[PDB]
Amino acid sequence: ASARKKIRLDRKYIVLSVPWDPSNQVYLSYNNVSSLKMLVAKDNWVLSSEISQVRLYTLEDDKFLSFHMEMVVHVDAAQAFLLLSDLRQRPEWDKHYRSVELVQQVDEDDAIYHVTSPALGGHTKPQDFVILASRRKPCDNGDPYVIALRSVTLPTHRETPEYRRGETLCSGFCLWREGDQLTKVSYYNQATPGVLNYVTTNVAGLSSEFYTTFKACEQFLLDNRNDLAPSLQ
Amino acid sequence: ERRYREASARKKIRLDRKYIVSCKQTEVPLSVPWDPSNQVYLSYNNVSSLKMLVAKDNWVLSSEISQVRLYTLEDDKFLSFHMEMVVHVDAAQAFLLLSDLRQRPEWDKHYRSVELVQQVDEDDAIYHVTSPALGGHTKPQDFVILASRRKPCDNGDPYVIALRSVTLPTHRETPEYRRGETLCSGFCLWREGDQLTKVSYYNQATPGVLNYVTTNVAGLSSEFYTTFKACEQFLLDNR
Ligand SMILES: [Cl-]
């Protein structure tokens, strides 16, 4: 199944950014967040695998092989929200984040980041991304905390030969409070063309780097479970 | 139209911040226990509450498209809204069609399914409704709703179809669905002539769907209008 499933997915899915403008920062931010929420609610998510109560789902759209991972972590959702919404700290737990640079603090809950990523799948250059991150605290009615990521273009931050400029359409974290010191943590990625080989390898079960990274995510949250620094920034 | 989109986006942020602390069951009777000994008053109160909501003086007209109107009331504990249009159907027939909650899934995508739980009397019934997951959720919602319908007492008065959440020992919350509550919703229908009816839908407080309400009210989405349009086409198809 594995090798064959991988090759089928590759054959199916082989071969996204929006211009940023200060005059539409509020709308772009809404759309960033709203897109992630809508992705969560799509009706055709299918469980691909489970390993140690951690679940990997896919959505095989006509355009995209979307995936998401879910786990339950013994950390407070508000704390998980501050820890995960600071993308500067993501290189610490996520190997796929080689570096992170804050381009533009847009407001309290929105920022543009320059992200670089190690090359994977034969490339002799790393990838880079210019990403709008938009975070929202929910109403206390059971809605999730949301940290939404989508690629944006800026006249000053176009691609240079140092990196393959990639794009991500709709990615990020949702966190649902499940109890005192219990959070359901999910990471979603709708479409990131430049890493499809890597996705299909993971989704088919030839690799478990997604599981490994999500384990390091949990450990990062637990290790920083009770840090005050996030809430005082 | 960038400017107008930016305004909408700002309005949603304002509203969301304003109601970020949801109204609780201790503060307002989002649901009430179903008590068959009190069935008469429970239905009376359901109708009277919707009549009072209608008569509130602080409704503000927030938008209009094709002479369909969306009003809002930014109350202190919750954000109430109501939609209003006039349809080329007899009020008496609209009354039968809109009181039949089991038919509501045919025109309202928010009603995924409806089960009649108890017919209390000719004009009052309790239903179990399921609703599709909105953005940010993976489980559908369910509700247990008392629907009480009344004809107009005098001329000028509306037909009233009042909905309010109730609880029952046979339909307690289950892990399969996120249980929602509605405080006071439903339809008022006024005769505007021969086969003209003013059709209004009201929703005082459904705290579980706040984000969806703010998106629509802010004008970033038009799903309220799309559903109300389908409502119209349902009524026209069923004359
Ligand atoms: Cl959910």
Author numbering:
A (entry chain B): 352 to 366, 375 to 592
B (entry chain A): 346 to 584
Q: What do the study authors state?
A:
Steroidogenic acute regulatory (StAR) protein related lipid transfer (START) domains are small globular modules that form a cavity where lipids and lipid hormones bind. The ∼210 residue globular START module is a curved β-sheet gripped by two α-helices. The concave face of the β-sheet and the C-terminal α-helix enclose a hydrophobic cavity that can accommodate lipid molecules. Here we present crystal structures of four human START domains, those of STARD1, STARD5, STARD13 and STARD14/ACOT11.
Group 2 consist of proteins containing only a START domain; group 3 proteins are capable of binding different ligands, such as phosphatidyl choline (STARD2/PCTP) and ceramides (STARD11); group 4 proteins (DLC, or deleted in cancerous liver cells) are frequently de-regulated in cancer and contain Rho-GTPase activating domains; group 5 proteins contain two thioesterase domains; and group 6 consists of only STARD9, a 4614-residue protein with unknown function, that contains a kinesin motor domain at its N-terminus. Of particular interest in the scope of this paper are STARD13 and STARD14, the family members for which the ligands are not known. STARD13 Arg974/STARD14 Arg449144 is highly conserved and is likely a key residue binding negatively charged lipids such as phosphatidylcholine and fatty acids. Based on our structural analysis we propose charged lipids as ligands for STARD13 and fatty acids as ligands for STARD14. All structures reported are relevant to disease. They are down- (STARD13) or up-regulated (STARD5) in cancers, mutations in them result in metabolic disorders (STARD1) or they are linked to obesity (STARD14;).
